[model samples]
Target chain A: ARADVTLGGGAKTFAETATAGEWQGKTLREQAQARGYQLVSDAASLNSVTEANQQKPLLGLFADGNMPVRWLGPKATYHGNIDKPAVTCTP
Target chain B: MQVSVETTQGLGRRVTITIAADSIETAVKSELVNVAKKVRIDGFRKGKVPMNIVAQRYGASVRQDVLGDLMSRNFIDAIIKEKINPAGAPTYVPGEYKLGEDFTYSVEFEVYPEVELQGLEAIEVEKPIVEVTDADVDGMLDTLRKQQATWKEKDGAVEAEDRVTIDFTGSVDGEEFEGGKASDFVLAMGQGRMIPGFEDGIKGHKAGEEFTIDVTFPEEYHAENLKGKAAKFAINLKKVEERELPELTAEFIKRFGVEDGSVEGLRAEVRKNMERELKSAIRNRVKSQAIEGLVKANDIDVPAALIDSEIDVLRRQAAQRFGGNEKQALELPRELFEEQAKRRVVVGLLLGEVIRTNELKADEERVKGLIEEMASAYEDPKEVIEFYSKNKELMDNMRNVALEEQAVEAVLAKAKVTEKETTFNELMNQQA
Candidate 1:
């Protein structure tokens, strides 16, 4: 869950080339590459890169939006939501 | 997660942990969703793969990985919750997992033994009262000169302490072998660098002398094919050289970092270093004797796991001396190190108990002093101190060492002590 060198996560599209928000019209991938961080998009690549170069920092963008919540529960809908059978999350 | 612990045997413990099935499903689903974005499939663009397809292809392996990871994570958590200090790695045994049922596994390991320190006053020690004499300092200077000695070609026959260049071919049972021939190999006589009888046969032979020597490899030799085998080496002594020691001159003194370049200054520095070495040697002798007395007085059962682990460390150290690969290191027989490993484990447990009960913490000033003392031997003492100050891990290791010495001193405080006057050579050589 926590690591020493450096770690980051964020929405992929906005950080990569969205031309808006905190990136300030520049892609975060190039910014991080200049600052000596390898960009990784999935778990295996991130693990392999980190394993080979343990001292280097990494920038992981695993989702198009904010990373998905680790634990999920029922979703809220209109007024009569609680009256129906409680439904389990699909994932 | 649910956890339960039971005692299996003496110093052994078994822990059973249970995790909800939903938790397992959740982790697997989370991993598949992440995989769906990056995994390649026919007719699917990057980041556009379907979740159901990813699940169908990668689900089983992902579940296995997730289950293994969760098992370790939960097992660690369970041990911490139970307040068990395992002396070795745990062995996991998982129960059959039926669908929609709570997954359960059991881990078994040995816990560290509880050490109770007693009979401290019964530890009798013969502390050596030693000093560095002028003769010892002179001997050390002679050694330093030998280190800086140069070699020159000699016309006399080869003798002990002479360096020789030779061409040789070795054969076993009248057949030439690999790694047995050389063109111009240079070797120092009486160094034990070659097999027995090889160097002895070369002695007293002058330049351009051709001869043969018969030797036998020791049974314990590292090479399997050569152990205890007889071999003959044909030799040609081409050149002989003798070591020429440098005189005690101004340049020699300056080369050794004596800035004043005076014989008296060099002697004073050498005396100071010898005195420091003598003090440390005496301290180590006393400390080891005290530990031996402690072990002799107290008897306790030590966990076999701890001793086995210590044997692994000893094996690695011996293999390093032989300069062998890791696989060869493991091949070293554990029987050679059993008693040493057991004694080391006992010492550690006893010392740890002493430190804990006495609340003896490593002194900050003592740690700094230890660093300064070590740095004094180097030319750039200030730079060495600064480097140690910047590296936290090195500082911590020194701190632990200082704390161990403190514990030893604590034992000596209660133990009986008598001083025996000893010369530097006698004390250093450990002459009985």
Candidate 2:
């Protein structure tokens, strides 16, 4: 029998400021669109079929570039949906 | 001559007479006579089967069973006659057995290790000194602030302590290296995430500027081709941003899951948390050091077999983290975790020896206090405590931890220690 383990918690979203002074005015979504496009293009250029499918789900707090450490509570904020499920079974 | 000894110990001992070939032939004949009356075979009447047929059909099993039964019965008889006091189980090591001669075996095992009680005052140790100060609390506040800081873009050249946005590609001898290029990488300038020269090189590069920076990979770099090799990065300075930290206001306090979001209230809470953290850290550090000292002081050779078994457990634990095949996990450079595993095993053996030699007992009150402290974090504290109290295995684990802690305290009481006043800020900084 196969089973998918779903692990999730409520995450808060915030408007993150970019580190680049030029992008300071741009919201996290705007910066993500710009950089995400560039990243997707670069992946295609490198023949990274796997990475070509990758898209940045931008969340804007800076202490951690992506999700906060789990020890930090749900209010700390995160980007993207937590949908990586593992399939397992006993033989 | 066969002799048997029974003792107070659980194991009884037996010695038996050595039978020559003639005696063995005679015993076999007599044994066949005993089985002939009950033996039956194809085309033979019950209890009338020939001796040769009976011997041929079940000879080996009967001979072995008879020998074992004889040895046990005789050993018990000898033990009872000798009146020896035995402690526990007897471990029988086979000595010599032959088809036509009497067999011999030897039993040897410790009845029990002598338990010696030593007074706590006799074991000299230094008490661990711990103090949490105002500065420490402020430092923790700064950490909280940093945790809450928002990253914003700036309109100036990247400088020290500034966060830089950059698009860059790295190449080794004109060939682009794998995982070497990134676009809009948001790197804190002084965080040491980048190579020693890479981040510093990004400094002063204004937005829209395109340039190539020369950098050399460190000797210990993970990539084989790039280790200690000179590389050039084609870089684009996208933007530079600075951190905007929020003031420690009542609003900010509320953000930290604090119900009464006031700076004073937050400060009090942070102080308590820091004190607790500092105490735990000090205890861990001191206990580890004490264990190391004890191991060095004690002359004991742990069995190689035990260490191998522990290494197996360590490998399994490491494999669980990777969520992959165990064999493949074991194939990785497991030697790296060996020293850590050995340290744990050594500490375990040392603690066991200390407990045994000192007759140290777990303080039930102290253990309960610890359990109460842990349960306090749960929503239903009493229920959690009750559940743990009812579970034998869980309770045993808690008791073991408490006993180890007590042992550490016992050792610490014997050492000469000096007190040093340290602030919470300094302690937090020390972690960094």
Which parts of model 1 are misplaced by more than 4 Å? A1-91, B26-61, B133-247, B386-397, B420-423
Residues forming the 10-long window of minimal summed lDDT in candidate 2 chain B: B109-118
User: Each prediction's TM-score against the native?
Assistant: 0.56, 0.57
lDDT of 1 by residue, B1-432 (tens): 677777877777888777787676676677766664557443354646555555536586677767777788778877887898677568888885544787788877777666867888988987988775777668756756664456666776787766677887877655656545666766666554555466677775877789888767666556656666777778887888766686776544443445455677667765555554555556667777887898887766667777777788678768877776575666677789988777766777777677666766567788677566566554445665777756654554555556656777887887898778765566646434
Q: Taking the tens digit of each residue's C-alpha lDDT, what string does model 1 give over A2-32?
A: 8676557532211111111111112344455
Instruction: Write candidate 2's Cα lDDT for A52-71 as tens digits.
Output: 11122122232211212111
Candidate 1 clashes between residue pairs 3 or more apart in a chain or in different chains: none
Error of 1 at B376 (Å): 3.9
DockQ values per model: 0.01, 0.03
**True-vs-predicted CA distance for residue B45, candidate 2, Å:** 25
Prediction 1 global C-alpha lDDT: 0.62
For candidate 1, report its TM-score.
0.56
